[PDB]
Design a binder for this molecule. Structure first.
Ligand code: CU1
Ligand code: CU1
Ligand code: CU1
Ligand code: CU1
Ligand code: CU1
Ligand code: CU1
Ligand code: CU1
Ligand code: CU1
Ligand code: CU1
Ligand code: CU1
Ligand code: CU1
Ligand code: CU1
Ligand code: CU1
Ligand code: CU1
Ligand code: CU1
Lengths: 117, 117, 117, 120
């Protein structure tokens, strides 16, 4: 994969983690928090996996590409799941709309890197 | 289910992350550090993925087996890779021997949970 | 102090996991709306403990100012998280357990702070 | 209030940029033939990236806000960014990756210090 595409994917992961954390926090402050618990949980998983993925991608050398691939697959899966749950709430909550978009961009960047590896 | 296997896997991830970070640090202090850079990188990847995996496994609200499986697969893959690289240096460095064993035990615990889910 | 360092790293990793588990358990409570500060403080504590475990693993003794500043942050957040979990500990065993993990990590951090000088 | 939330957003952005700069520097140092001379740089890069990502997360949360916690995390971030900048600056003449990282650390340090002065 391109070193520039790798840097772009790292940036997407770092930004997606932050977007998810912001959304989880916003959901926690909603009066309807009891209806947003899966959103919050999936936000937390996505942040944790994105954070790990950003770090792993920063050290990618092409040797043991199996590690990089496995981490990207996990990140794409969690970003997709988080985006799906945020998108369910996006009509009611702008924070969920914003987070869904960040999750989709990270998902796509991870898939692009997976295809290029 | 397999609540005991889940608890065991979480514990293994926490132990493995510490073993990996200790190994990375010890490699950085070796006079032969230039020969240990893949070990260091893979140690760091393994610690990062193990701590994310322990976090994801600890969460039951809004459980999504797709996420759980993907993260476990990533953890098993990175633990296997880290174990392999540490094992190359285990004859020369006790820190690498110890880390390899921790990686193998975590790999097996992840695989066991994957099979039981 | 190498033993106290290893103990503190272990405490930080365990405290992060305990906080994650508590946050998740609170998210699944029907009274989740009453537990939002607990959840938020759990999330902060996990994030700070995770960073602290990593930073302590690389401590070399020179640049003790980094180690001290991170330990102070970890002790502060652990104490705050323990205080908030303890508010709910009579009603929720998960909060009781989490408070105890926060206290043990707080003390391990303070012990290292006193020994670094 | 309003000015605080904008200063927080600025600091979050700086932390995310700084973490990436630090991880790029750490990786580049690991690939240098002179890696044995760059081990403190690598370690401090990793500390800075870890603390920056934690700090960005803490700053993103407003539910149940506790200024004492937020200040302690910002102090840690300011301290580690200053330390990382100092160590990268030692190598900046020889390595562009270290020069770039030093500048990112200084900008993040200042954003954290701005928030420390303003909150608090
Ligand atoms: Cu969501
Ligand atoms: Cu949402
Ligand atoms: Cu949201
Ligand atoms: Cu969301
Ligand atoms: Cu080792
Ligand atoms: Cu190792
Ligand atoms: Cu090794
Ligand atoms: Cu709590
Ligand atoms: Cu709890
Ligand atoms: Cu708690
Ligand atoms: Cu609680
Ligand atoms: Cu540096
Ligand atoms: Cu450097
Ligand atoms: Cu550098
Ligand atoms: Cu640097």
């Amino acid at each position: 994969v391109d070193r520039e595409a790798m840097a772009r994917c790292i940036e997407e992961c770092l930004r997606c983690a932050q977007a998810c954390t912001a959304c989880a926090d916003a959901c926690l402050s909603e009066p309807t928090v009891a209806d947003l618990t899966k959103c919050i949980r999936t936000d937390m998983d996505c942040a944790d996996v994105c954070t790990a993925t950003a770090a792993v991608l920063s050290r990618h050398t092409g040797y043991d590409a199996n590690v990089t691939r496995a981490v990207l697959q996990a990140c794409a899966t969690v970003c997709a799941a988080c985006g799906d749950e945020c998108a369910r709430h996006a009509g009611m909550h702008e924070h969920c709309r914003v987070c869904a978009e960040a999750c989709r961009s990270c998902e796509q960047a991870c898939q692009e890197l997976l295809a290029g590896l």
